[PDB]
Amino acid sequence: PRGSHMDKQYPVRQWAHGADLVVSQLEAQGVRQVFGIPGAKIDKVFDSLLDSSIRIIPVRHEANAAFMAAAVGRITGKAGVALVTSGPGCSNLITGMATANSEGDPVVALGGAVKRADKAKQVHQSMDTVAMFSPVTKYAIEVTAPDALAEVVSNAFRAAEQGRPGSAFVSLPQDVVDGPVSGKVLPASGAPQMGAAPDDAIDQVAKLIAQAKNPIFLLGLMASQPENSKALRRLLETSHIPVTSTYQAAGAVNQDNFSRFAGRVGLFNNQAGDRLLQLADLVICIGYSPVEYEPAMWNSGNATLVHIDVLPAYEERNYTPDVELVGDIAGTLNKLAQNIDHRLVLSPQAAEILRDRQHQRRGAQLNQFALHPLRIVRAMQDIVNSDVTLTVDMGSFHIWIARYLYSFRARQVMISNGQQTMGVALPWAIGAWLVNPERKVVSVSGDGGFLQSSMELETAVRLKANVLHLIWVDNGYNMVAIQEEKKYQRLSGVEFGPMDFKAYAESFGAKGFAVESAEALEPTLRAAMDVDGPAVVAIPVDYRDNPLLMGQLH
Amino acid sequence: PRGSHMDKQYPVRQWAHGADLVVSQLEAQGVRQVFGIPGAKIDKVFDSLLDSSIRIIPVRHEANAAFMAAAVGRITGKAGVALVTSGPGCSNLITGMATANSEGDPVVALGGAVKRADKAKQVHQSMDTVAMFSPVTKYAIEVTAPDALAEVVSNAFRAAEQGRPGSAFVSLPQDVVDGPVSGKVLPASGAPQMGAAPDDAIDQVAKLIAQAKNPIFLLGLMASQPENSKALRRLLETSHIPVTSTYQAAGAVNQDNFSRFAGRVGLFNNQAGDRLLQLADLVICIGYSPVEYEPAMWNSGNATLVHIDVLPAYEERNYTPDVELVGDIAGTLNKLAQNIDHRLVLSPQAAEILRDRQHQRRGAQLNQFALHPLRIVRAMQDIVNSDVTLTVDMGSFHIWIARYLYSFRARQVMISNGQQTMGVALPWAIGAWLVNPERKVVSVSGDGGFLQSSMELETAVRLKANVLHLIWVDNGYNMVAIQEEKKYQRLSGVEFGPMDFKAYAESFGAKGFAVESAEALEPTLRAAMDVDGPAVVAIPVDYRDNPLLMGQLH
Amino acid sequence: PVRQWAHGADLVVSQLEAQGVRQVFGIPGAKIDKVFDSLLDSSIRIIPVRHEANAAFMAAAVGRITGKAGVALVTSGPGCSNLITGMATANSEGDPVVALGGAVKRADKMDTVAMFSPVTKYAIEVTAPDALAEVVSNAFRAAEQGRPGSAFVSLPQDVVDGPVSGKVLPAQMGAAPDDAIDQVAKLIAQAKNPIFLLGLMASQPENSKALRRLLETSHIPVTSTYQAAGAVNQDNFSRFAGRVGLFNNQAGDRLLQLADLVICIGYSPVEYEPAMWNSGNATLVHIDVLPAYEERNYTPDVELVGDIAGTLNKLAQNIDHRLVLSPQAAEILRDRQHQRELLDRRGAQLNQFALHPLRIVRAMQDIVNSDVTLTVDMGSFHIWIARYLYSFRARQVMISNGQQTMGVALPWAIGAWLVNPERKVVSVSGDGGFLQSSMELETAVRLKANVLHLIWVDNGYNMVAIQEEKKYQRLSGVEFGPMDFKAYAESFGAKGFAVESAEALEPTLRAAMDVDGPAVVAIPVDYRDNPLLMGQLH
Numbered sequence A, B: 001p002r003g004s005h006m007d008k009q010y011p012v013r014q015w016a017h018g019a020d021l022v023v024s025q026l027e028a029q030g031v032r033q034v035f036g037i038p039g040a041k042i043d044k045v046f047d048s049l050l051d052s053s054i055r056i057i058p059v060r061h062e063a064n065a066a067f068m069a070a071a072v073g074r075i076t077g078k079a080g081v082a083l084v085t086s087g088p089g090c091s092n093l094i095t096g097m098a099t100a101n102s103e104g105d106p107v108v109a110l111g112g113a114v115k116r117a118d119k120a121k122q123v124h125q126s127m128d129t130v131a132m133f134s135p136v137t138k139y140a141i142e143v144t145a146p147d148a149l150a151e152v153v154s155n156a157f158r159a160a161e162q163g164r165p166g167s168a169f170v171s172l173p174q175d176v177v178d179g180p181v182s183g184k185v186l187p188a189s190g191a192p193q194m195g196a197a198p199d200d201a202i203d204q205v206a207k208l209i210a211q212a213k214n215p216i217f218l219l220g221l222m223a224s225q226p227e228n229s230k231a232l233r234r235l236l237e238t239s240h241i242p243v244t245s246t247y248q249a250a251g252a253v254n255q256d257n258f259s260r261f262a263g264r265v266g267l268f269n270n271q272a273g274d275r276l277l278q279l280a281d282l283v284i285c286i287g288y289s290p291v292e293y294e295p296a297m298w299n300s301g302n303a304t305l306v307h308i309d310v311l312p313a314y315e316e317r318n319y320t321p322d323v324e325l326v327g328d329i330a331g332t333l334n335k336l337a338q339n340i341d342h343r344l345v346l347s348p349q350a351a352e353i354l355r356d357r358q359h360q361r362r363g364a365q366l367n368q369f370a371l372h373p374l375r376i377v378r379a380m381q382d383i384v385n386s387d388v389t390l391t392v393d394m395g396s397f398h399i400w401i402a403r404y405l406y407s408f409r410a411r412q413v414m415i416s417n418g419q420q421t422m423g424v425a426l427p428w429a430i431g432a433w434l435v436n437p438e439r440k441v442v443s444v445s446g447d448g449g450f451l452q453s454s455m456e457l458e459t460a461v462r463l464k465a466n467v468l469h470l471i472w473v474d475n476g477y478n479m480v481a482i483q484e485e486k487k488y489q490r491l492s493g494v495e496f497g498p499m500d501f502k503a504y505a506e507s508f509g510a511k512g513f514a515v516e517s518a519e520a521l522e523p524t525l526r527a528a529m530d531v532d533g534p535a536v537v538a539i540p541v542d543y544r545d546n547p548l549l550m551g552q553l554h
Numbered sequence C: 001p002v003r004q005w006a007h008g009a010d011l012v013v014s015q016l017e018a019q020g021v022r023q024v025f026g027i028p029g030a031k032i033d034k035v036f037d038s039l040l041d042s043s044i045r046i047i048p049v050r051h052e053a054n055a056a057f058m059a060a061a062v063g064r065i066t067g068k069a070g071v072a073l074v075t076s077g078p079g080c081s082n083l084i085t086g087m088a089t090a091n092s093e094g095d096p097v098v099a100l101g102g103a104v105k106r107a108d109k110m111d112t113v114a115m116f117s118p119v120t121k122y123a124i125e126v127t128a129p130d131a132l133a134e135v136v137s138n139a140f141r142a143a144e145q146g147r148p149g150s151a152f153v154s155l156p157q158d159v160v161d162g163p164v165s166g167k168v169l170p171a172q173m174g175a176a177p178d179d180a181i182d183q184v185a186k187l188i189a190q191a192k193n194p195i196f197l198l199g200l201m202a203s204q205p206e207n208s209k210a211l212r213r214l215l216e217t218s219h220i221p222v223t224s225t226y227q228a229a230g231a232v233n234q235d236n237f238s239r240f241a242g243r244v245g246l247f248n249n250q251a252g253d254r255l256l257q258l259a260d261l262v263i264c265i266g267y268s269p270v271e272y273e274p275a276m277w278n279s280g281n282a283t284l285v286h287i288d289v290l291p292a293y294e295e296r297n298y299t300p301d302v303e304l305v306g307d308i309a310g311t312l313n314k315l316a317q318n319i320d321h322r323l324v325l326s327p328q329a330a331e332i333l334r335d336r337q338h339q340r341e342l343l344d345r346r347g348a349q350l351n352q353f354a355l356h357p358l359r360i361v362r363a364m365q366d367i368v369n370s371d372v373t374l375t376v377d378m379g380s381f382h383i384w385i386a387r388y389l390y391s392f393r394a395r396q397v398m399i400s401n402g403q404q405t406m407g408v409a410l411p412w413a414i415g416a417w418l419v420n421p422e423r424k425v426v427s428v429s430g431d432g433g434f435l436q437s438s439m440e441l442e443t444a445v446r447l448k449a450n451v452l453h454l455i456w457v458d459n460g461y462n463m464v465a466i467q468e469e470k471k472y473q474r475l476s477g478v479e480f481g482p483m484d485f486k487a488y489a490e491s492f493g494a495k496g497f498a499v500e501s502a503e504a505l506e507p508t509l510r511a512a513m514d515v516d517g518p519a520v521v522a523i524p525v526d527y528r529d530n531p532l533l534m535g536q537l538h
């Protein structure tokens, strides 16, 4: 009957093992799989998952379990789950949990721990994981009372999925998950029934839209959630105000569904969105937090600033909103749309800025070897259609793809990377494929980022994941090298040796390719896409022109 | 003149870049190389190292920089150095720093950080690294004042190398290492001139040795340091008291130089050392901390307990020493040796226990496929001579090697692993080889542990490291599986797919081998040893008999 | 506007003015004396206290009444650490408090931020002079917004002394969605034993009118935690079931366990452990400014997050009919009426010496009318007053004390009086709690605060003694010596009163009330009957 009744499909049982209650709680959360590596302290949860519909997916390095979990979280909106053992099993997650928290990806990590009695000493894993995960999670707690077992797990998903999503860590002592517990599953509660910002405030902003002549919407992470899709589109059609998005909101609005989309901001200093922002007399931020794009780089201060989000702003020097609309975003945008009396008439400069953007949007006329980056971007465009997901690692290739991200027509793109973690592309792709295994996923990284997570190629083969991984090969850490060259005119620690990435992939049981010539790139990628399973393509790249592109950055 | 004079070979300069002072301080510490991966926030230290005798060694994953650094620290006694950039560059070190701290390996990690002005916000790397490293280091601090730059680095090496050694982390904001500083290098101070434990106390223990009839020495980490080698041997010869060692002291005393060595304790429940400890009426711990071997597993409480170490004991339930000798170990053992009036006369049981140990110390008469573990141990014994270093990863193979560690005659063995971190063997071997590049290093791991650090095979080829890596291949996480089988009679998350490890190694430019038959093992290892560079040998293993060996554990 | 400030302290003070700060409590020191100095050029009033802990107490009273954070200003080192207990008490009770604590120069860097984090909503140190106004503004925002709490800001000496470039930052939710209020209105109709459980936020002044309208159109019975002890009383709502959390014989507890629908307003599980009232056999509705802090025994079926006042008004508009009490509900409320009658006597205090507690309570009731504020310290007297809260007709009562800190009454009263100095404030404490903050009698005299302080004198820590007697039948560490509190109060320059006889307390309290300034009244009490009252506790 009630949510906390002692008689329901969620009965109050005498559980033989706390792990059984943990697994039942996961089922209530809608968890479909678990990523991680087992160990003695946590093997009972792995064991209990055998009697569950939840799928166990062993990875080869815990860090990639956190990466896969984040991809699951971003796509589905419900937290991806990592499951690791105590000690180095937990500490191997920290970078992944930070990357998830930075991007707003809901992730729950369940980490084993020594028996409670052994915490008062120095044993094989006397590791204070809560203290280590606290700085890089929304939520980190250890279950010290077996009664609070289901409560702690439920609160972890609640912290990860609600508000501005983030990562959550739960430490599970061995004796708690092995021993008996008395409790019940806590059914999952959705989002709060939040009200729109107050009418006196939305009318105030509506009056600013009329009085404004160069208004622009700045979309943040929360603007890209599905709950706000319909409301956001309805507001853009009735207002016709131009829009620009951070990379955490890179998918909220595409150029092909809204004519006045001004591109993505946060990376390049020559974007239509940037010019419209500095030109703007009214900026309305939707679902945006300053962390997504430092306000010091776009807020000139000569414009009225409106904040629309599920949480109050964290005021700062270059982000002191004059009006603050706090509440349900969808409800706020709907009420705001009701008070739009007329559609915007673009100013000459504003209109010219959008024209200049579309006029820009070389190429394939570049048979040089090694392949020029702009050529690789073109070949990627031809294979990444609306049915393919694209995951992008971190490096110089990342900047090239971001520069031409308007031209990719992918169903979804995972590229946003505030922490700038390398090695994310491949595990992101495996997680994304598991959500929609009927579709193709294309992951792209450098040779540096590739080897930090290439161990998961074995996981991809074992899963038969339909993932095509592209490696831009330069035998170095180029994105760092270019910075050293500009600053010091010499390189330090950015060069390493070559590899036979074709045979490397084949040793995992996957299909390997190596672009030997500029004419062989399209034939090779074409063949690699047609592979019904894991495939890797090594693409020698010539980064000589990188200094030209990097000068366009902030 | 004085250590802090403003006029000396360590002059007070106006440094153009804090990084220059950092590098000069490293030179004063005797640092020969630096392991890590560069980045924008820290690239000035990499740049400054170009003008230095210190060698830059790029790795492919930061975690392995911490592992290599630990090996350097254990062998030389001076801290190995890791150098990483901010954000995920630092968080990727945490597991390695914990493994170093647990084993007492001196390691200094220098991690980049955002500008000081950008710490008061959420930027690309607003990561509180000090809070994350504190639980797994002896020392973690961030340089906020450029004047304290050399002080902080000096104190990091001091914390790492002195007392019970450990890992230390220093966070270096970008503006501090890029901007100018005014300071001087701090010359390195050796160990304190400590005095022996008080005479009234050493005589008290000397009187206990006489009154004792089953005394035994329990050697800990500090007993294996070179400063105590001569004193320890002199005490064992004049006393002839039996000796047993933790694995952190596995090298302090070898069976071939002392007849009454009772093996290593901490892993197996059927060791001569264990029987002598439970039989003992007097246990003298030298350089030992309870963390090395839980006193609950060997201290029955029916024996007088003496503590000899550079630090006071941390009393606990099963470790309340009756006598406490605190001071310089070497000086304490020397004074104690002066008061030995006669050599011990072994008791019948004590003598019988040592006889039973030597009588034990199958084999090669096992042509079964896959190769029986005991056969692999024999083939390893034939190639690991006194000129070879042996590094051992974590897994079921680890238990087999530990069971027969008396039979290996290696110059040095790195096997101790309290945190039980997998992936340590290969990076340990690269670090060890760099200290003595004229010698051969043999590293052994499983297929699970191999892929967590196999990325460093590229580093080994690039370094031309004379490292032979052996993989016990079972296509699973066996050491975990055996625990699940005994506890639940079913497996969960411990199986993965096969790989062509021969071609895998060859893709890095290294020599690859695959033992196809039991008769080919010795021929293959023989050939792989004769390789003058990196080589990998895949060894299919049959773990069917593992349950028999694991029953001999605590 | 952006201004070129000569000293960071100038920007701090201007930011405080923008926040509406009327006074600052604290003690100056070298690291922070520039903020004290800058306050001379400000309309803000400097109120020196005699112990920093009491600055946090006074600040909390200002915060609770006005809704804008009270401000404490202390120097580095022990100046900050002396605040921790006060800041913890403010955070626990939901009182908005901003503490500005000095710190050594940045170049010379007690880790105060680490020490205040566990007992504050917000703790930060200003390391960049540019972010000075940002941090102060965010501190007030953290303290005053959402569920209010305490906030700490560490100000390095060089930051407030040196020049800064910045601007002042000038100083709001909508009602729950209509589709969600229609959902709740339908549940009230189908319900037959509904009850409101009021929490902290239901007691805020913004929700007073809306709450009354909801109770009038619904006539649903009400029970309150002690953080909401003032939102509703027995004399203004007939179906008030008392306050829950302290006594084991309250109508509110019985109605909650009987309820088939519980609507919590402004409530967090921390105010009253849900394990003691949520049986799980009822639909649970959560109405608050924040999402529910879910736990085992608190998984609401409906969650209304938004402006409480706007939500309750809209909900009251959709109530089609008034509740018809069930027999048990009516009987429970009847039993409370009979209980209140039994709690009353009337009795002629046969044991005149020492004065019986019930006699002191009546004498307090006669002087605490609707124009008087009452602050209550912690001790056995606290239980007595809590037992008879229904009978007090005070303008405001400060009694809620989850941390159970002693010494709060007097500084609470001084802070409360400063908000409305034209009214009388009555503070009551024990002899133990009195001496932990009695130093502020000098502040009261120096301020001419119209505060009447009552001391229940037993020469011991009674509330602990009674616990020891029940557990061990012997006392340990709960006895101390007597004091002549009349001369004690008079030595501060305040009026001192000593209840010499049982007939003189009302004459004395009457005379002490007629004092237009600080007054202290020592009241010898006979706690012999305490075991009878304490048996009524959980």
Ligand SMILES: Cc1ncc2c(n1)N[C@]1([C@@](C)(O)[C@](C)(O)C(=O)O)S[C@H](CCOP(=O)(O)OP(=O)(O)O)[C@H](C)N1C2
Pocket: A037, A038, A039, A040, A041, A085, A088, A089, A092, B394, B395, B396, B397, B420, B421, B422, B445, B446, B447, B448, B449, B450, B472, B474, B476, B477, B478, B479, B480
């Ligand atoms: C970072 C980290 N993450 C997780 C664990 C780990 N390190 N260490 C182990 C350990 C020692 O911790 C223990 C005993 O398995 C355990 O879980 O308690 S080793 C082990 C290594 C894989 O096995 P591998 O193939 O290499 O060896 P075989 O046994 O021969 O097959 C396993 C998965 N562990 C958990």
Ligand SMILES: Cc1ncc2c(n1)N[C@]1([C@@](C)(O)[C@](C)(O)C(=O)O)S[C@H](CCOP(=O)(O)OP(=O)(O)O)[C@H](C)N1C2
Pocket: A394, A395, A396, A397, A420, A421, A422, A445, A446, A447, A448, A449, A450, A472, A474, A476, A477, A478, A479, A480, B037, B038, B039, B040, B041, B085, B088, B089, B092
């Ligand atoms: C965990 C971690 N450790 C260290 C860094 C990292 N992640 N991210 C980068 C970054 C983005 O952080 C930045 C800009 O290079 C930097 O240092 O600031 S990416 C980069 C990845 C290697 O380059 P790769 O071969 O893959 O790509 P190419 O550029 O095409 O050659 C580099 C080494 N970084 C530092």
Ligand SMILES: Cc1ncc2c(n1)N[C@]1([C@@](C)(O)[C@](C)(O)C(=O)O)S[C@H](CCOP(=O)(O)OP(=O)(O)O)[C@H](C)N1C2
Pocket: C378, C379, C380, C381, C404, C405, C406, C429, C430, C431, C432, C433, C434, C456, C458, C460, C461, C462, C463, C464
């Ligand atoms: C800071 C602090 N330090 C210590 C305690 C405290 N606060 N609070 C109390 C408390 C409520 O906490 C409890 C119930 O006594 C307890 O210990 O649990 S109050 C209480 C005050 C009783 O003495 P007092 O003379 O003031 O009142 P009478 O009862 O009339 O005599 C007692 C000393 N406490 C412990």
Ligand SMILES: [Mg+2]
Pocket: A049, A050, A051, A052, A053, A054, A055, A056
């Ligand atoms: Mg399953």
Ligand SMILES: [Mg+2]
Pocket: A133, A134, A135, A136, A137, A138, A139, A140
């Ligand atoms: Mg956190």
Ligand SMILES: [Mg+2]
Pocket: A446, A447, A448, A472, A473, A474, A475, A476, A477, A478
């Ligand atoms: Mg590269």
Ligand SMILES: [Mg+2]
Pocket: B049, B050, B051, B052, B053, B054, B055, B056
């Ligand atoms: Mg060099």
Ligand SMILES: [Mg+2]
Pocket: B133, B134, B135, B136, B137, B138, B139, B140
């Ligand atoms: Mg530490």
Ligand SMILES: [Mg+2]
Pocket: B446, B447, B448, B472, B473, B474, B475, B476, B477, B478
């Ligand atoms: Mg294996």
Ligand SMILES: [Mg+2]
Pocket: C063, C064, C065, C066, C067, C203, C204, C205
């Ligand atoms: Mg209030």
Ligand SMILES: [Mg+2]
Pocket: C116, C117, C118, C119, C120, C121, C122, C123
């Ligand atoms: Mg806090």
Ligand SMILES: [Mg+2]
Pocket: C430, C431, C432, C456, C457, C458, C459, C460, C461, C462
């Ligand atoms: Mg008292």
